[PDB]
Amino acid sequence: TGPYAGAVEVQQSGRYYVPQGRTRGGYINSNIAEVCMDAGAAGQVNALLAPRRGDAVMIYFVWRPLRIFCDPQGASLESAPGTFVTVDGVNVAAGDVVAWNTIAPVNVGNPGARRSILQFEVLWYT
Amino acid sequence: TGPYAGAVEVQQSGRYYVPQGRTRGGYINSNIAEVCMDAGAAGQVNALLAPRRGDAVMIYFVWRPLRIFCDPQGASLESAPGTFVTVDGVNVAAGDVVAWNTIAPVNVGNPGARRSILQFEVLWYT
Amino acid sequence: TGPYAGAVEVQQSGRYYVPQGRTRGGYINSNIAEVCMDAGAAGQVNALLAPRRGDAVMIYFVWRPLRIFCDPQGASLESAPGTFVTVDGVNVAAGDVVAWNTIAPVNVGNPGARRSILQFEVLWYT
Asked: How far is A36 from chain B (nearest CA, A)?
């Protein structure tokens, strides 16, 4: 089991999908979620990464941008540079394992000039 | 391990591919298999999730429709409302965990009016 | 954990990307790496499959070509037949688990007439 096993729908990985607004997240499978982000966008992603309340007290995860992904038409696109993720105000790097308490704010930012998709993969949990 | 380690070919997740018939399933990796379905299609999927006789014992898996995926030319598509899976004549809701004894029939249906892709993720087994 | 957690970027699975050269590798998630190959290409893949020096020292993996993937504009493509991988000079079939030490040469080949994408999935490592 992974924290997102009970999601009732998943989506294809790497396909940009943000129908209204500037950010949108969805699940890929039990352990991976992705947030599609327009240019110059920022948002909080707690509701998305958090396992259902009462289920966990701590989640371990890593994040990273997708070097290549696609637009709604099937065309290749590359993530903007300068994407960041802060956990409890601390800026966390892509590739580093971060211990999240389930409570603290996880902010995601895409200051860059093109669209980007960020992936969060939950590692071990409990 | 995972039950489908050993499949000899996998495919890109979320890409609609039904060359012959009204349904087709394939593997995505060791714990995940997807099944593409045309509008108003039904299919039995035991042989796909039935790993190989003797190794298998009992399988616990979840299934969920893909909210967005693509057609063979790369355009975004959304799964039709109304998909269902019955495991041994019992209706299983997306996201509910199901114990499968490996022998009962797993039916899959897409009574709706557009294509859909269903994902089956295997959580544990032995 | 998994060996490719630590990779600082990932890419969409099954989307052909080889901007300069005959083959290119990238990571999909913590246990999976994909290598795109132009028609009639070969290359050595150690640098991609190797967990960083000192961490791991024995990797078990399986590899398999993708039956269907896409080109950069999103159209469906099928992997050419005849793909092969050799680990320390031995031929390893798709679907077979191979034990690797991180040192021995891993050759990859696409003798066929068209593009292909091979998948390497790491199963355990101690």
From this structure: 13
Interchain pair C69, B8: CB under 8 A: no
User: CB A11 to CB B64 under 8 A?
Assistant: no
Reduced to 3 states (helix: H, G, I; strand: E, B; else coil), residue B6 is coil
Of A14, A79, A124, the CB nearest to C15: A14
Which segments within A49-103 are labelled E, that is strand? 59-65, 68-70, 76-78, 84-87, 90-92, 98-100
The residues, any chain, with a CB within 8 Å of residue C26's CB and separated by 6 or more, are A67, A68, C9, C10, C11, C17, C33, C34
Helix (H) or strand (E) holding A10: none
SS3 (DSSP) at A97:
coil
Give C62-84 as a DSSP string.
EEEEBSSEE-TTS-EE-PPS--E
* Cited resolution, angstroms: 2.3
Token pair in block for residue C92 = 């390893």
Method by which the coordinates were obtained: X-ray
Cβ(A32)–Cβ(A121) below 8 Å? yes
Domain ranges of chain C: 1-126
B73 to chain A, any CB pair closer than 8 A? The answer is yes
If we measure between CA atoms, which residue out of C68, A15, A30 comes closest to residue B24? C68
Does domain A1-126 fall into CATH 2.30.29.30? no
Q: What DSSP character marks residue A39?
A: T
